Design a binder for this molecule. Structure first.
Ligand SMILES: O=C(O)[C@@H](O)[C@H](O)[C@@H](O)[C@@H](O)C(=O)O
Ligand SMILES: O=C(O)[C@@H](O)[C@H](O)[C@@H](O)[C@@H](O)C(=O)O
Ligand SMILES: [Mg+2]
Ligand SMILES: [Mg+2]
Lengths: 395, 395
């Protein structure tokens, strides 16, 4: 009998609790490095005078070591001003990590938010938490002896990949075409052309020239970087229907929800946006407002893997596709865990930071058998480091 | 420099892929057992004539072993008819598990759903997937060398606990009071009284008597098991405002969303419901309808841990508290991962199925250091097995 007239309580032997036997964070190292770009990069934002050419990328790295011998590495970044503040805030809160059980990632995330309650739950502050949140996930995966994608649960072992770095606006049409062949010869699965420059006639020129070389089937997409007004948007979009694009990215201001929704409803061509958003809440607004067919969150920018997962689930409920922005070293795993077939964006920019490189085969990026994110920092990463600080003591 | 006038591509050395190195399921064992209840249990569902007293509990157990030596165990249950069906379906689809990477839990779930597409994505079919889904989560946690709660990431190391098995309707008042003392003496953190019997006057008598015995502060709650109609629910609700209960559980039919919402808005006392729901979508309709203050999902009933996690995220997003129903062996880990302070429900019924017992101290149930769920099947569980089948070959 499993019961009786009166209630009965059992007795346990192993009185050891998970609280007293868990691992503990003992050391943390933060670094602010700068990825130099010999060739200044220009997208529509530069062509319209909104910003100056990009000449480098700030990278904020977090390395965490546990008492039991596990290590996690993660990073956040900034294109243009932001790296100094992200590093500074991370440095002012990292101390809170010492002594915590590295497995309670969200409990830690919460403690970090409370420590910086005055500066919000979105934007820079959470971007200061991203490298730490990502390092903790990296650690958990390693603890389990699995690539991050497998710790989360994968739906695919590889992800379609397209290249962006070779289609910017500071690049003459002839070079863009030269980059296309190089990219295809290397097994890229798609090409994204940066558009949205004052001269609309030119973007059409450059765009028609690319579609010609690639043929009719090769996945092609465009990105206006928020440089069109509603009128131009629908106009250009309606005209671009003759390219069967995978998507039209950021046709309008990142916060113009109704404008994007309107565009998405008026065109068969999918609309993509969200890379500039810096929190789950911001992405939720775009999603509830049916702003786009493709959601493009950025783990470092939204606060790390933890918030990114929430964004993924929400997008999934609304049947939206996923096309993460930048940092493929982290997004490869996240997009591998997405229910619907995603797209991965490719840049070579971060390659020199790591000792390993991802495998690009037949239009797809394959997940290696390496644990966690599957990357180790290179000598170059240390050379490019300008500021660093440590907490605790190496176990 | 990290970039150039053209586009650059590196090359990967470590050519091994996660696809070719992942673990693989090689053996699966399913069992249908019956937990005997020598003392027939009856709540309001019996006193109103809807059902007959409960005399046993069906238990569907799944055991999975991987090529690399990992093992996982999980289960679902059925109070009254349903167990033969759950077992029958699990047996008809289990074979699909062989050769699958056990870490891709959602991927496997989807494959199992397609294997039985004809029978839906809710109800019995997912309750047949439950044992398997739970076993896989149990396996992943063990692979990481962590209690399930830590694999998920805990917000607490113990959870407030209340007893239910001592306050049922087939139990005379004085016996209930006796169980209360016994329960309180064993360190219980709360008491739930079964109400909703035809004689409303008699429940008030029992409720008053219990509140008197427990004192003013001790956590007390009631459960009507869907036996009131809207008129009675509100009437009993006003009348109970005085006892300052932690919550009023299932005052109406489990699918009367507007009814619950109306009671929730009308009363200060929290309203709880959800134990009868059998899928994420079902719970989602109640949550989007603002039906209750406390959401009470049942992992075995909703399809396992995977869907239970989505229910948690949805509930959290709407600021609702969590109070999982039954199966404390699994819910301890899930509730520990909930961001808002949850409640765990205690029954002794399943204690004999496992060799290990949970530690109850100071009104809370503590998570032990044992990995995965932290339970191994006892011999008594084998004694109570009526049917069983196996697939593959034990590695
Ligand atoms: O989708 C992308 O990768 C681009 O949208 C880049 O974020 C680009 O703006 C950036 O590299 C820049 O040039 O400012
Ligand atoms: O919340 C509870 O514990 C109850 O709601 C039980 O599920 C009860 O109905 C069941 O044990 C029964 O007697 O039918
Ligand atoms: Mg872009
Ligand atoms: Mg109940």
């Amino acid at each position: 009998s499993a019961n009786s007239d009166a209630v009965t309580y059992a007795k346990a032997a192993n009185t050891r609790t998970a609280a007293e036997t868990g691992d503990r964070i003992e050391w943390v190292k933060l670094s602010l490095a700068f990825l130099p770009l010999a060739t200044p990069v220009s997208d529509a934002k530069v062509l319209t005078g909104r910003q100056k050419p990009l000449t480098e990328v700030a990278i904020i790295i977090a390395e965490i070591r546990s008492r039991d011998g596990f290590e996690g590495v993660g990073f956040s970044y900034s294109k243009r001003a932001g790296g100094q503040g992200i590093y500074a805030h991370a440095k002012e809160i990292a101390d809170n990590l010492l002594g915590e059980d590295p497995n309670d990632i969200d409990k830690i995330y919460t403690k970090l938010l409370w420590a910086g309650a005055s500066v919000g739950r979105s934007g820079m502050a959470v971007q200061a938490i991203s490298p730490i949140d990502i390092a903790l996930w990296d650690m958990k995966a390693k603890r389990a002896g699995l690539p991050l994608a497998k710790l989360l649960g994968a739906h695919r072992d590889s992800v379609q990949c397209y290249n962006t770095s070779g289609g910017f606006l500071h690049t003459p049409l002839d070079q863009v075409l030269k980059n296309v062949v190089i990219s295809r010869e290397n097994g890229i699965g798609g090409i994204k052309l940066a558009v949205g420059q004052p001269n609309c006639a030119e973007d059409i020129r450059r765009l028609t020239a690319v579609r010609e070389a690639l043929g009719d089937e090769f996945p092609l997409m465009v990105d206006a970087n928020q440089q069109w007004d509603r009128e131009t948007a629908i106009r250009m979009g309606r005209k671009m229907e003759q390219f069967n694009l995978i998507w039209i990215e950021e046709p309008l201001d990142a916060y113009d929800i109704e404008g994007h929704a309107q565009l998405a409803a008026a065109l068969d061509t999918p609309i993509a946006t969200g890379e500039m958003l810096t929190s789950f809440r911001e992405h939720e607004q775009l999603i509830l407002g049916n702003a786009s067919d493709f959601v493009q969150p950025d783990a470092p920018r939204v606060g790390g893997i933890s918030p990114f997962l929430k964004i993924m689930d929400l997008a999934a409920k609304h049947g939206r596709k996923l096309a993460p922005h930048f940092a493929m070293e982290v997004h490869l795993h996240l997009s591998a865990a997405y229910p619907l077939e995603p797209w991965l964006e490719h840049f070579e920019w971060l390659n020199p930071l790591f000792n390993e490189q991802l495998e690009l085969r037949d239009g797809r990026m394959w997940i290696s058998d390496r644990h966690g994110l599957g990357f180790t920092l290179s000598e170059q990463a240390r050379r490019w480091t300008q500021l660093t600080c440590e907490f605790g003591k190496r176990p």
